[PDB]
Amino acid sequence: YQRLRHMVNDKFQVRSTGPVNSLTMQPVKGRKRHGGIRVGEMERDALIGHGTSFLLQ
Amino acid sequence: FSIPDGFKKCKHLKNFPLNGDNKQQQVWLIKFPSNVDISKLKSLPVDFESSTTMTIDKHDYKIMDDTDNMTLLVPSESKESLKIASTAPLQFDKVFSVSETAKIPAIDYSKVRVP
Amino acid sequence: LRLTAEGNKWRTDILKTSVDTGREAAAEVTNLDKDTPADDPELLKRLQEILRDNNKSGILDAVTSSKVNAITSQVVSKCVPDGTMKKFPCNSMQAMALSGAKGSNVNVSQIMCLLGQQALEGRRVPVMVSGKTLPSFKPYETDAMAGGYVKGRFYSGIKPQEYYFHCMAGREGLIDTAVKSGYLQRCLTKQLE
Amino acid sequence: SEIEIESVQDQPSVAVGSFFKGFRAPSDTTFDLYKKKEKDEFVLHGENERLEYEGYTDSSSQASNQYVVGLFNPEKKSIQLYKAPVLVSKVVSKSSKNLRGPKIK
Amino acid sequence: SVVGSLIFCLDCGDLLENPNAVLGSNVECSQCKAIYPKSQFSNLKVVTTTADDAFPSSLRAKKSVVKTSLKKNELKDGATIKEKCPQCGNEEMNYHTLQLRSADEGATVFYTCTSCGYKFRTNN
Amino acid sequence: SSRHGQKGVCSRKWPTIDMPFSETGIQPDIIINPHAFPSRMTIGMFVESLAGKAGAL
Amino acid sequence: IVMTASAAIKTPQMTLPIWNDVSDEQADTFCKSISKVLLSEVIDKVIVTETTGTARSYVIHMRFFDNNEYSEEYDVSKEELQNVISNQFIHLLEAAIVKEIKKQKR
Amino acid sequence: CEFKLELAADTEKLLMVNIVEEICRKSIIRQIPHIDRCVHPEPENGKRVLVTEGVNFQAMWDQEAFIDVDGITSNDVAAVLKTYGVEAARNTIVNEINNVFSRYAISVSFRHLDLIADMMTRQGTYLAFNRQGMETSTSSFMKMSYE
Amino acid sequence: RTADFRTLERESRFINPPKDKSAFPLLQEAVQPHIGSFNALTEGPDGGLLNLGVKDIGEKVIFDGKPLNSEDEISNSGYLGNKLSVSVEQVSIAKPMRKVYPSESRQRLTSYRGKLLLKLKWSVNNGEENLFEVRDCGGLPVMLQSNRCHLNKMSPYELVQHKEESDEIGGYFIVNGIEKLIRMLIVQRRNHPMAIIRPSFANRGASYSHYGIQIRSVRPDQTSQTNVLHYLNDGQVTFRFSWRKNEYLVPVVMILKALCHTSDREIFDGIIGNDVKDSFLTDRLELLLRGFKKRYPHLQNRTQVLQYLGDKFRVVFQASPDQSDLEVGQEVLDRIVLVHLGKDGSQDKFRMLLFMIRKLYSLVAGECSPDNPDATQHQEVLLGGFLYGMILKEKIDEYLQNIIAQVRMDINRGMAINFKDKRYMSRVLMRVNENIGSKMQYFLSTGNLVSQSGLDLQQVSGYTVVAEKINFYRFISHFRMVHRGSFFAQLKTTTVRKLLPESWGFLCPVHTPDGSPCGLLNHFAHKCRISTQQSDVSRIPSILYSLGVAPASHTFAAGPSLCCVQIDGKIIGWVSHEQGKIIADTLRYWKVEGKTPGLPIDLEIGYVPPSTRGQYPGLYLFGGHSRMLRPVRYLPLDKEDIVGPFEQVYMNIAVTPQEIQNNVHTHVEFTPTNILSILANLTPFSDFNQSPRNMYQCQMGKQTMGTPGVALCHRSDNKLYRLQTGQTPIVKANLYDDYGMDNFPNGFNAVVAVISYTGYDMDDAMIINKSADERGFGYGT
Amino acid sequence: MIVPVRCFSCGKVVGDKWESYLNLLQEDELDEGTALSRLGLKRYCCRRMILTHVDLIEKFLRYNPLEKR
Amino acid sequence: KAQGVPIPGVKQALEKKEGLFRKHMMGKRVNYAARSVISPDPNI
Ligand SMILES: [Zn+2]
Ligand SMILES: [Zn+2]
Ligand SMILES: [Zn+2]
């Protein structure tokens, strides 16, 4: 057996309230910088899908 | 012209028996490798078509014969140098080419193909 | 993964008819009566005509494939499960395919019987300008193995010639996944939201 | 069928020069042969009122191949062999030796 | 030397102009002003045949010694596996193999019925 | 991963008391699920298993 | 369909439901009728004997397949072939040669 | 068919074979407009049909003795819309999208397809899900967030 | 009685690093195309590559206008003037040394730059007086374990004593502390006319067809120059080439008449052989000859053609202002048309050009099938060291251009002084950027190709990659990895990625990555070798002529109806197809036999038999650099034979000796393991695994936390992954020992049970024993 | 690196049996199998522990930044 | 619609890649969120 060099979650992160960009005032990009997880157009579409307007809000 | 350097003009040229009577005359062209000695051989075995066999001091040869531009220049006189051969331009009656052929050994299958 | 001595005998006997299949199909597409020999000079000239055309080679590949795949189906139908040494419910390899836990009878047949005809982009194995499918095979060889038909199984192993053919099939499967609904769904969702 | 040879000449006498397909010439002009001293290289040169002929031997062909020309008898069945060099001959015209300025604009 | 529709000089080897473009009764070479013709050169003709591959058709395909087209039904599906038909209940069923998605993902099976002729797609 | 392209993430570090124990008294170092092999068809690993055992003994 | 609503589909098709009173042979004959041949499809060989005279003389010989062969493969008569060559082909050939003379001199 | 062509002395050399070849494959003796080949496949679910490799309804309308003119199907949506109307094109969209899924043995509820088709035919035309079809939409913000 | 592991032998070698020849020669044979390539840059016949390269761009002349100041003569008005001729006669890297070892650079995080020596030739007033000054050319990176490097003649005891690995491979460059290697590239096979159908050719110009010929001519200094032939729908043939970064088109009948004095009938006999009755050819050739006579009626001799060519290219080739149109014309020919035959070989260039026209016409008619560029048979491998030498030649050409630029600045202002003064030369030279070392350090640090010509390559980036040492398996695979090209990665074509039978024994069928680099980032077979140079090539025409090859200069007959004999793209003669195979078979016989001195074993004998609408026939022999070569067992004599991918296509090579069929087999493989890579061979029972799982293992072994080295206490790498408890495999291929993989363990032998018990293991999840982990099982740092 | 203390699978001390194993292969000239048996390793898990040990520490030690040459 | 890399205009700012509307309105980076590798569990 061979042990592969990659950590299982090297991309393991958690953010409550971290730093934000000046222009958008939205969570800044960067795991180590206490950055935010992006909720993209497809996740927006899925939240519209469930008819779950407060989850989208 | 005069050029190139180290080249001397050919003054003496040996006689060529050219007549072209009629029981007729035949002009032959032969190709030979540098390895074989022409002055050593006093007899050349040759037959019609591509089929030929020759062996001169361990080395084996084959005389390829083909039916069918090259121009033959025959000396009329030693002082007249060289002139184009004609009867009525001239072409060779029979053209031959000596090719060195080597005998490739038969594969010893009983020794190489093993279960 | 093992077949019984009885079951393995059936496998070798059905696969013994596959040697003729290669030349039989090659003689059918070429249109030659009494089934001409594999080394026939007119047949070899006729197969060359097929080699130079993409459509003609397609007719040859589809005919030979259907015929060798019929030999594959026969092996699988006979040997699995009536020829397997260990049988269901104890044969776990067989059990997982039948239960729907993991795998299918196709995977089971590649393991215990044969890999079959290695199909590349709907056709057989690619062939060189010389008429050779590999430097090991004869130019314009009328054999199923030369076309990519693997008689070997993963339990017994694949013959070096067979293994190279399998690799071509494997790589082709991988590239299509990498190369090939994001924009199609995005266009509908923005107009239907 | 073994054919006998009467005489062999290792001295310059008769030569062969290839031009192109369909070469006639006036058939009254002369061709001056030259020699350089393992293997000897030959140079051919001719002159005419409107044309000029120039020939030479291939360096890669001379050291590797030895060409010979012979005359055959229909009754005696004997060949008289004479060594002949093959000269790659080109023909230059009156139109040649024409050129413009070394540097134009 | 005359070849087909081409007329070449015997002295230099230059291609002589067409007898219709230049002045009548006499033709001359551009390199050396050589004396020509002989009127024995004759009205030159060239027999140019068609490519044979230039006209691809169903009839030209029927003129080929090898098979160029398959019959309406004379082409049977070779691959067959014992599987229960979800349509009604049949034993004989055709199949197809191809490795879709990533190198980690499994193989997809494409089933086909013989009684009706219904295609299928299921990985496991 | 084994030398047969059978990679898997560490789901848990199972205790030896809770681990299945052999007749010999050995508990496996690594546990591979049998449902991995029917789809991958990595029979090289299967023969590697009985070869490695034979060579160890 | 969904993304481009193309009026120029790659494989445009028509499904024609045939009656019961029309047989399998009749339907196949009908398929051929809709089926259409081209001058290329009936020609076997073309021999052009270019003779330069006076005047460039071009002897164009159209060697077709046998009359019964193309009539059974394309449903085309010899009369149908005559009209196309005498009205279309020669007018199209003359226009192509004139265009090639201009392109040579341009 | 033999015919002689006489050209001027100034016309000189020309590649007649290549010129003839190109015009022969350009010359039509026959062909029904917009149709290339008509084939006879195996009867689809018991229905006796003929599959055409082209679209021209008005031409097939003349073959009433062979074809049932009230059942002549076509995959080309725009061609169906032009001759038979918006509701016919709408029915072609739901059938054609279904053919794409049924081939890969994927079942999609017709409630979805009917909605998609109704949205494409909302303007009485054949609109696609793209910048062009979207032009006729009230929300400029929806449009701005598309492209 | 077994295929055991060396335990006693291993541990003794671990303590005692050999003082003699290093163990595992296959490991050094793996980096053989890398080290060898860089070795040929200075060592070998004709002083390596650079000396030849400087000669090609040997002189640059800049003239500043001045009055001649002589007596009454029109020469004063014409004063081109006096030429401050400049030249370079020799360039040589001295060393990267006060000797300095490679290891110091790694700790120091600085480039292991070697000092360059560049001496000039300054000639003025037609070179009456010339002064040569040896000047620093700047600093350039030097490959480790190369001739320039001090470790070239080193040993394993000695390597450990110099803080390196006992069996250190090399092949890479230490640049700013980062080990970077030049990636090998798949490029068109040198000196071979290729008939290709491309729709790209049509969309460029007016009435352009798909048909065309492409030959990649290579200079002895390894720089390439591609010449393309185009068949226009008019019946015209055009010659395409590239200078600077622009394409240029010239009529083929013009480039033919410039090479040597010939008649229109000499061109006719040269292309059309005894097949004079072929109406297709009779018309096409008339279009060419009449077209040239119509367009250029004034060009009636070789000199006029050269002058017309010189007049139109005097600006682009920059050859001015004293160089005549005859000189510039010849300069164009010598630098562009079929450069593989080189200068003083215009007769050879003429013969090869006629052959390309006949091949082009055979492709249009259909007599010849198009050659596939994506296939392994019609390609070679551009080695790193050769690429390094090419860009070096480019930088020294730029260096000379800069000297002239400084003189042009000087003469266009203050005027300063004369060229005969050494003081002025020394003043110009220190005002010019001579740091070529930094320019070469940039290429090895960015992979970006900055060039005035752009070489004969399509891409401009990614020529260099970090020699990633995360584990030895990934590290050794880098030096066996070959890429088709970065340009090919951005294409919708799948034919390029397709594994082909032409790759058998050259390109590994298993070892290719998953996803985007699939079928593009290939790996060579473990027994595959790449040509570093050529020898005895000059003695082979003598052997061929003796075997019945009729000389091309006397024969005058061409076409697919007859066999064409060529040696490294040099058409030497003509023979029949029957005799063509006889020569090809008899050559191979005297090749394997150590009795013949003029015939080398590494020679490629590419015979192409005649076929019905198949490949263009001929006897295309090869001996040159970059060729793909592999060993096989030749059935008669039972001896080793070296085979290339071009000749293999028509060759019948059995896999196992039991599969040898009578009258249809000439060769047999030594071991079928010769067709796989190092990593592909290392996979246990791979002939029992499914195809994509064997492929995934190569990628897995490359990503494993194993041993990146043992000399880590003298390293300073970005990041390293080290398995603490390495173990030797019980189940292993014997080639594991042949590459001494026990020096770098990649895993551990574990008790594995195929069981569904815990419930936490399912498809992509596996269970590890707690007590095993507690005992240090699979621990890493 | 060095011989592991205890067998990964069961926990039987293996670290004291490395140098003794090489002595049984060198001086005693025994085979791999019989040597392991004399050390008291009958389970195949304990058997592979020493049998499969590489001992890269001897290769690693040859680089010493504390002593000259 | 200028020059012919220049400084981007306000039109370019609203359409940088996918655009301000797509990258920062229709989709957004969020607070009170976490990411991790999933592991199987039959006991939950
Ligand atoms: Zn003339
Ligand atoms: Zn059914
Ligand atoms: Zn233990």
Structural commentary:
The structure is cut from a larger assembly and holds three copies of chain A, one copy of chain B (115 residues), four copies of chain C, one copy of chain D (105 residues), one copy of chain E (124 residues) and one copy of chain J (69 residues). Chain A is α+β, with helices and mostly antiparallel strands and 57 residues long. Chain A contains two helices and two strands; from the N terminus they run ββαα. Chain A is flat and about 50 Å long. Chain C has a single domain (1-159), classed as Orthogonal Bundle (Topoisomerase I, Chain A, domain 4). Chain C is 55% helix and 2% strand. Chain C is built from eight helices and two strands. Chain C has helices at residues 5-14, 18-29, 41-52, 54-79, 92-99, 105-112, 160-179, 182-192, and strands at residues 116-117, 149-150. Chain C has a two-stranded antiparallel ribbon. In chain C, helix 1 (5-14) packs antiparallel against helix 4 (54-79) and helix 3 (41-52) packs across helix 4 (54-79). Chain D is mostly beta strands. Chain D has one helix at 59-62; strands at residues 2-9, 15-18, 31-36, 42-47, 51-56, 65-72, 78-83, 86-93. A five-stranded mixed beta sheet of chain D has the order 2-8-5-4-3, with no helix packed on it. Chain E has 124 residues and is mostly beta strands. Chain E has one domain. In chain E, strand 1 and strand 2 form a beta hairpin. The chains are: A alpha+beta (57), B mainly beta (115), C mainly alpha (193), D mainly beta (105), E mainly beta (124), J mainly alpha (69). Chains G and H meet through strand 1, helix 1, helix 2, strand 2 and strand 3 of G and strand 1, helix 1, strand 2, strand 3 and strand 4 of H. The complex binds zinc ion (ZN) (3 copies). One zinc ion binds at residues 85, 87-88, 90, 113, 115-116 of chain E.
